Amino acid sequence: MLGAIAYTGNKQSLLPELKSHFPKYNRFVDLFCGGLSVSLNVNGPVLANDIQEPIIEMYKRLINVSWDDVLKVIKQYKLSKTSKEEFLKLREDYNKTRDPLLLYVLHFHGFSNMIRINDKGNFTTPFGKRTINKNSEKQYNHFKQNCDKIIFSSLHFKDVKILDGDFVYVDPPYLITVADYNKFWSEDEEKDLLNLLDSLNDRGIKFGQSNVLEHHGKENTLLKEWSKKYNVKHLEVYIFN
Ligand SMILES: Nc1ncnc2c1ncn2[C@@H]1O[C@H](CSCC[C@H](N)C(=O)O)[C@@H](O)[C@H]1O
């Protein structure tokens, strides 16, 4: 099941596998939603949250965007596989105005379609010598057909209000994995995350955790020890109460 956008660490192929272990719930909360491969593909209501506000705002905007609108912008900027100057023009325009629609368009032309925002909130991905294709409109339509059940938020997982009755799915940056968004992670964050989880479990709230116990060289240790407290499936693992 497709995510709304390409994303490092997406759960596109693993979703069907994880879903079988999901409990009943009043609301599904995708705490670190990322590219939405999970959010778009589970029964709602869904609360999709991610700390990267620019991306969340982009999703919020797409709610009332048609593929038509996307095309108009692409033509407006005369984007192609070699429009390096127009790409740069579009990038400046987004950095100055922060129009989420522009961010969506930009990503189709950035290197490897990856979104990179620095501390000031500017897009830094270099021109990717590419433009939209077929798979492009597919992910979009999939977004549009499944965004009704979703409410978006852009908060640190700590500030997210957890309600009785919801299932909290968490797929945070892997403390031992290579990825852009790891810049928000730290052993500190993980410690707080696991403590929140122990807390949810105490309220009777179900959660599910995706992560890597030991990928190449390095290994996650506090997790392996902490995971013993719960059930772990080996696919990378899935830890749930
Ligand atoms: N403190 C924090 N609070 C909330 N989200 C955070 C965070 N630090 C990092 N994140 C987010 O956690 C995400 C983990 S990657 C999740 C990918 C998602 N499962 C998918 O299929 O696309 C990153 O995209 C990042 O935006």
Burial 62-82 (b: 16+ CB within 10 A, else e): beebeeeebeebbeebebeee
Full set of structural domains in the chain with CATH: 1-51+147-241 (3.40.50.150), 52-146 (1.10.1020.10)
Rounded CA separation 213/234 (Å): 10
**Closest C-alpha among 133, 141, 196 to residue 4:** 141
> Under 8 Å CB-to-CB from 210, ≥6 apart: which residues?
11, 14, 18, 169, 170, 171, 236, 237, 238
For the Cβ of 57 lying below 6 angstroms from any atom of ligand 1, the answer is no
* Packing angle of the helix pair 100-109, 67-76 (nearest 10 deg): 70
Instruction: Sort 106 into a burial class: Cβ within 10 Å, 0-12 / 13-18 / 19+.
Output: buried
Residues marked as binding? 7, 11, 32-37, 50, 156-157, 171, 181
Rounded CA separation 220/191 (Å): 12
Residue identified by tokens 């965004």 is 147
Rounded CA separation 218/221 (Å): 9
Nearest C-alpha to atom 2 of ligand 1 is from which residue? 156
Pairing assessment for the beta strands 237-240 and 231-234 based on DSSP bridges: antiparallel
For the Cβ of 171 lying below 6 angstroms from any atom of ligand 1, the answer is yes
Instruction: Report how far apart, in Å, the C-alpha atoms of 227 and of each of 29, 33, 75, 174 are.
Output: 21, 22, 51, 15
Is the Cβ–Cβ distance between 49 and 32 less than 8 Å? yes
Residues marked as binding for S-adenosyl-L-methionine? 7, 11, 32-37, 50, 156-157, 171, 181
- Determine the residue type at 139: Q
Rounded CA separation 183/219 (Å): 18
Q: Which method was used?
A: X-ray
**Closest C-alpha among 159, 166, 176, 193 to residue 47:** 166
Burial 23-55 (b: 16+ CB within 10 A, else e): eebebbbbbbbbbbbbbbbbeeebbbbbbbbbb
- This PDB structure is determined at a resolution in Å of 2.3
